Amino acid sequence: SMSVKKPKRDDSKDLALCSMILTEMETHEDAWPFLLPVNLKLVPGYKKVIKKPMDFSTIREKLSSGQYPNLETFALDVRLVFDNCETFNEDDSDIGRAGHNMRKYFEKKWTDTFK
C-alpha cells in the first residue's frame, strides 16, 4: 500500500532473457506454424473465429519496440499463440501437435528462467 512496498525483485535482465527465450522458440523445428501471422485472406474462418491473432514475428516486433510493460504481458502473448492454435486446429494434426509441443517447451524455459 502507500509507503509500504515488498522488496524490489531485479527485473533489469527480463528484456534480454525474454529475447533469448523467443530466439529459442523461433529456432525450434516445430515453430513453422507460428513464425508469421496467419494469412487472413487465405485461411477461411480465421479472421472471424480468432479474435486476437498472435505469432512469433509480431511478439518479436512488440518486444523490440518496448510494447511489453513487463514479463507477464510477454508470456500472455506467447500463450495466446498456443491457445489460438488449439482453438483452430485438431489435436491430431501436424499443426495441433506442433502447438502442444511448443507450449510445453515454452513453459519449461519460463519456469527455469524465472521461477
Q: How many CA atoms lie within 13 A of 7 on its CB side?
A: 2
CB 14 within 8 A of CB 71: yes
**With 0-12 CB in 10 A as exposed, 13-18 as middle and 19+ as buried, what is 42?**
exposed
Backbone angles phi, psi at 69, to 5 degrees: -70, -25
CB-based contacts of 45, cutoff 8 Å, min separation 6: 88
At which residue does the C-alpha cell 488449439 appear? 86
At which residue does the C-alpha cell 495466446 appear? 80
How far is CA 82 from each of CA 9, 10, 68, rounded to the nearest angstrom?
29, 29, 18
- Number of structural domains in the chain: 1
Give me the amino acid identity at 45. G
* CATH code of residue 99: 1.20.920.10
Domain span at residue 101 reads 1-115
Whole-angstrom Cα Rg for the chain: 16
Q: How far apart are CA 22 and CA 63, in angstroms?
A: 9
Could you say which DSSP state residue 52 is in?
S
**Structural resolution in Å:** 1.9
